[PDB]
Design a protein around this ligand. Structure first.
Ligand SMILES: Nc1nc2c(ncn2[C@@H]2O[C@H](COP(=O)(O)OP(=O)(O)OP(=O)(O)O)[C@@H](O)[C@H]2O)c(=O)[nH]1
Ligand SMILES: Nc1nc2[nH]cnc2c(=O)[nH]1
Ligand SMILES: Nc1nc2[nH]cnc2c(=O)[nH]1
Length: 613
C-alpha cells in the first residue's frame, strides 16, 4: 500500500545509487532518534540510505524498514553484528550498472519471503497442533507424530472409478523415477517394507538427498541381490517374496507403528508375468491391510489387455519418469495404525481400468523433464487431510497461516475474523499495491485493527509481528534473521498472546512511519494531538497495530513517570522510536461518523470499553 523499505547500502556501494530514480536518504551519524522517525516518514516508495548507523540497534533498524545491502558479509550495529541481507557479488558491483544492481536487489528480496514465513511457521510449530491451508512446505517441517496438518491442496492426475483427465499443466524435471518415488511416499511411515529393492542405489540416493526422514524410518528391504548395508536403520533380507509369511516374521506386533509396504518386483514369449507380479504385490498387501497403513505397488500397463482389474485406491503417473516409460504407481490406502487420518482416500478395492486411458496418463504427464510439480501434488494429496479452514471446528490449538485471504475466500470475511479470534497465529493480506506473484485480496486495515484485537489477541502487521517474537522469543526468532520488512508489512498477523505487563510501548507496537505525511494527505483529500493521532492511523488504513495493548499503555502507563517508566522499559528489555481517556472516545466517534456500515460495530465495542475500561 504505502510501507517501504529503507534500502541501506554500505559505503563502497553509495555512488551508483545516486544515478537511480528512487529517493536517496543521506546520513550523518548524528541524527538523534526522533530525527530518523521524522525523516524516514517522507518517503512513499522504497529508499536508498548510506552513512553511519553504529548508534542504533537492529530491532530499531528493522522497525524503520531497513534492508542491508553491502558487498561485505556484515555491518557493525549497536545491538549486534548483523548478517547483510543482500550480498552484492564482487563482479556485479563493480561494474557499476545501476540496473544489474537493482535487479540483484529484487531477486534476493524475493528469496527473503521464505525467511519471514519460516519465522511465523516456526513459532506456530512450537505453539500449535492443527495447521490449515497447508502445503508441502508445512508438511516438510512438521512432526507428523504430533502436528495435524490440513488444507485443500490442488489434486494431481488420478485414475479410478472415475478418471476425469486431464487437463495438462506446465512442469519441470526432477529426481530420477525411483528416488522421486520415495520422495512422495515417505512422510509419516515409521517402518518401510520395500520389496525388490535391488542394488540399493535408489535407497542410498534417497539417504544422500533426504537424510532426515531416511534416518527416522526403519527399512526392511527385500531382494536376493540386495547388497550388505552397514546402516543400522537398514535391516536387509536376501529372501525372495512370494507370500505375506515372508514379511510377517519381520514385524513387531506388541508395539504400534505406521508401516508402509512398497512393491517393485520384476523378473527377467509374452509377459503375463510382469502382470501376476504387480497383482501378487497387491494380493499380499491386501492380506496385510490391517498391519500396513498403505502400499505403493508397481503398475506396468499391459499391451495385450484392453481393460483389466486390480485392487487399488489410486493410480497415478510417476515424476522423473521417462516419456516412453509405460508404468504407473498404484496406491492402496489400508487400515492399520497411522499418524495421518487418511480415510478421505477410499479403502483399496477392485478397480476396472481401461488401458487406453491409463495409456493417456503416461502420454500427458511422463517426461524426463517433467515431474517437479507432480511430485509436490502427490506429496500433499497423500499426506494432508482434506479439510476446509473456515468450516473446521477444532478441539486443539490451531495455526492458520497464508491461506486465509486467498481469492477462493472472497466475500467470506466474517468466517475469517472468526478464525483470527481464536487462532494461535494466523495472517491476512492487507497490501494495497499492484501486487505481483501473489493472489490474495486485502482486508481494510482499520477493519482488521478494530475487529482483531481481543483480550488474548495481539493484532500486529507482519513487521511488528516479527519484532514481537524477537522481543519475547529470542530463540524462536533470532535477532539476525534475514527478512523483508516492507513485505512483512503486507500482512496482518494475529497471535494468541497476552498484553505485556507492564504494557511498555515497544517497537513491535509503536512504529507509525510517515504518519505526518499520512495525516496531511487525509486532510487534502477527505478532511474533518494524541486524539488526531489515533484517528489518523485508522483513517489512513496504512497501518495495522494492536488497539488493545496500545490503549493499555496510553492510560495505565504514559504517564506514569519520566522516572518510574524506564525503569519498566529496561527490564522489559524493550526499545522504542519516539520520545486523555476522552480524546480517544471522540476519535472513535469521528471515525465512525465518516463510516457507518463499512464497519463499525465495534467501534461501539471499543467505545463501551473506554467509558468503562
Ligand atoms: N507397456 C506398454 N508398452 C507400450 C505400449 N505401446 C507401446 N509400447 C512400447 O513397448 C515397450 C514396452 O514393452 P517391453 O518390450 O515388454 O518393455 P518393458 O517391460 O515395458 O520395459 P523396458 O525393457 O525398460 O522397455 C516400450 O518401448 C513402449 O514404448 C503400451 O500400450 N503398453
Ligand atoms: N513471505 C512469505 N513466506 C512464505 N513461506 C511460505 N509461503 C509464504 C508466503 O506466501 N510469503
Ligand atoms: N516428494 C516431495 N515433494 C516435495 N515438494 C516439496 N517438498 C517436497 C518433499 O519433501 N518431498
Amino acid at each position: 500500500p504505502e510501507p517501504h523499505a529503507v534500502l541501506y547500502v554500505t559505503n563502497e556501494l553509495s555512488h551508483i545509487v545516486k544515478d537511480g530514480f528512487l529517493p536517496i536518504w543521506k546520513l550523518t551519524g548524528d541524527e538523534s532518534l526522533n530525527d530518523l522517525w521524522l525523516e524516514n516518514g517522507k518517503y512513499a516508495t522504497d529508499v536508498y540510505a548510506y552513512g553511519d548507523v553504529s548508534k542504533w540497534t537492529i530491532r530499531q533498524l528493522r522497525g524503520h524498514g531497513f534492508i542491508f545491502i553491502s558487498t561485505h558479509k556484515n555491518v557493525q550495529l549497536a545491538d549486534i553484528i548483523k548478517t547483510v541481507d543482500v550480498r552484492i557479488p564482487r563482479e556485479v558491483a563493480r561494474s557499476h550498472d545501476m540496473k544489474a544492481f537493482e535487479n540483484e536487489i529484487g531477486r534476493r528480496r524475493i528469496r527473503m519471503r521464505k525467511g519471514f514465513g519460516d519465522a511465523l511457521r516456526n513459532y506456530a510449530f512450537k505453539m500449535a497442533i492443527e495447521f490449515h491451508g497447508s502445503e508441502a512446505e508445512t508438511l516438510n517441517d512438521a512432526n507428523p507424530r504430533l502436528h495435524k496438518i490440513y488444507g485443500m491442496p490442488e489434486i494431481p492426475p488420478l485414475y479410478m472409478e472415475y478418471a476425469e483427465i486431464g487437463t495438462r499443466f506446465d512442469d519441470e524435471p526432477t529426481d530420477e523415477k525411483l528416488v522421486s518415488m520415495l520422495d512422495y511416499i515417505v512422510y509419516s511411515a515409521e517402518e518401510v517394507h520395500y520389496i525388490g529393492c535391488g542394488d540399493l542405489r535408489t535407497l542410498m540416493q534417497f539417504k544422500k538427498r533426504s537424510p532426515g526422514r531416511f534416518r527416522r524410518v526403519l527399512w526392511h528391504v527385500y531382494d536376493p541381490i540386495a547388497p550388505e548395508c552397514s546402516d543400522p536403520n537398514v535391516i536387509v533380507h536376501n529372501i525372495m517374496v512370494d507370500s505375506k509369511k515372508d514379511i510377517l516374521k519381520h514385524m513387531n506386533f506388541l508395539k504400534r507403528v505406521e508401516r508402509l509396504f512398497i512393491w517393485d518386483v520384476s523378473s527377467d514369449e509374452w509377459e503375463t508375468t510382469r502382470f501376476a507380479e504387480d497383482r501378487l504385490g497387491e494380493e499380499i498387501a491386501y492380506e496385510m491391510g490391517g498391519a500396513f497403513s498403505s502400499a505403493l505397488i508397481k503398475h506396468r500397463i499391459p499391451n495385450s489387455k484392453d481393460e483389466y482389474h486390480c485392487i487399488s485406491t489410486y493410480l497415478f503417473p510417476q515424476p522423473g519418469a521417462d516419456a516412453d516409460m509405460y508404468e504407473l504407481r498404484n496406491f492402496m490406502r489400508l487400515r492399520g495404525y497411522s499418524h495421518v487420518d487418511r480415510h478421505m482416500h477410499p479403502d483399496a478395492s477392485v478397480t476396472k481400468v481401461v488401458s487406453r486411458d491409463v495409456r493417456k496418463m503416461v502420454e500427458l504427464y511422463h517426461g524426463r523433464d517433467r515431474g517437479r510439480f507432480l511430485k509436490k501434488r502427490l506429496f500433499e494429496h497423500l499426506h494432508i487431510v482434506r479439510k476446509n479452514g473456515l468450516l473446521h471446528e477444532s478441539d486443539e490449538p490451531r495455526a492458520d497461516l497464508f491461506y486465509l485471504t486467498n481469492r477462493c475466500n472472497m466475500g467470506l470475511e466474517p468466517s475469517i475474523y472468526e478464525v483470527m479470534k481464536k487462532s494461535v497465529i494466523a495472517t491476512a493480506w492487507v497490501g494495497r499495491a499492484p501486487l505481483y506473484d501473489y493472489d490474495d485480496f486485502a482486508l481494510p486495515r482499520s477493519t482488521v485493527m478494530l475487529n482483531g484485537s481481543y483480550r488474548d489477541i495481539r493484532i500486529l502487521d507482519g513487521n511488528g509481528a516479527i519484532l514481537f517474537l524477537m522481543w519475547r522469543y529470542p530463540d524462536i526468532v533470532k535477532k539476525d534473521l534475514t527478512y523483508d520488512p516492507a513485505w512483512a508489512m503486507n500482512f496482518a498477523v494475529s497471535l494468541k498472546e497476552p498484553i505485556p505487563d507492564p504494557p511498555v510501548p515497544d517497537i513491535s507496537l509503536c512504529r507509525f512511519i510517515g504518519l505526518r505525511v499520512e495525516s496531511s494527505v487525509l486532510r487534502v483529500r477527505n478532511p474533518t494531538d494524541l486524539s488526531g493521532h489515533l484517528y489518523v492511523t485508522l483513517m489512513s488504513g496504512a497501518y495495522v497495530t494492536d488497539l488493545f495493548w496500545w490503549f493499555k499503555m496510553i492510560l495505565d502507563w504514559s504517564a506514569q513517570n519520566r522516572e518510574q517508566k524506564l525503569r519498566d522499559l529496561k527490564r522489559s528489555a524493550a526499545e522504542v522510536i519516539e520520545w486523555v481517556r476522552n480524546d480517544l472516545i471522540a476519535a472513535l466517534r469521528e471515525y465512525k461518523r465518516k463510516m457507518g456500515m463499512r464497519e463499525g460495530a465495534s467501534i461501539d465495542s471499543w467505545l463501551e470499553l473506554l467509558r468503562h475500561l
